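In practice, a research group might receive sequence data for several interacting partners and want a quick structural hypothesis before committing to experiments. The following worked case mirrors that situation: the sequences arrive first, and a predicted assembly follows.
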Amino acid sequence: KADIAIAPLTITLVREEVIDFSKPFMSLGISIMIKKPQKSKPGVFSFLD
Amino acid sequence: RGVQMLLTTVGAFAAFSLMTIAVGTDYWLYSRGVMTHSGLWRTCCLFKGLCKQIDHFPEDTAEYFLRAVRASSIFPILSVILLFMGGLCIAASEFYKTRHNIILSAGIFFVSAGLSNIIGIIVYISANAYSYGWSFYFGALSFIIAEMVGVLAVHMFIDRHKQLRATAR
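A structural hypothesis for the assembly, expressed as tokens:
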């Protein structure tokens, strides 16, 4: 149905069994998403801080 | 003699009335998403006129303890009940003062109730984190009148103690 796919498709072993793949253009990995640490209320711990 | 006692009595009555007005309404003011007043129990906006209990305690363990103290106004309500108990003790000691030692304990409980009301004012100021209400200033004025009434009460107590020490010799 298509000729070539230019899209972020994950290159796996089970997808090599039917089609081919070129070399990766951009490497990546699994990351950690947290919020930015803003100013939190320190409270009673501020006296001997 | 009795004039200073009547002045202390009406000062305690005025401090209790201003504490009641501070419990009642218009303690603070906060611009919500237009200004809105609050009296440590419910909030009222300036739609305009609707009132609801906005004292929702949920949305370290010391933060949860501070939230539990700021919730339901545990300090100033018990402070006002202790002021009522001290006023009842002063009214019971004003008529037929048989024992000359209950006035000292009543004044000590009155000063401790004022200190607890100041601690509750510190809690209510710390939990606020824009303007302020008039009942907060009324509660501060009642705290000043309570401090002066405690000073006058212990002054009359040491005068009565000096009179008893002079008559006992």
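Before designing any experiment, note the following. Chain B has one domain: 3-165. The first helix of chain B runs from residue 2 to 24.
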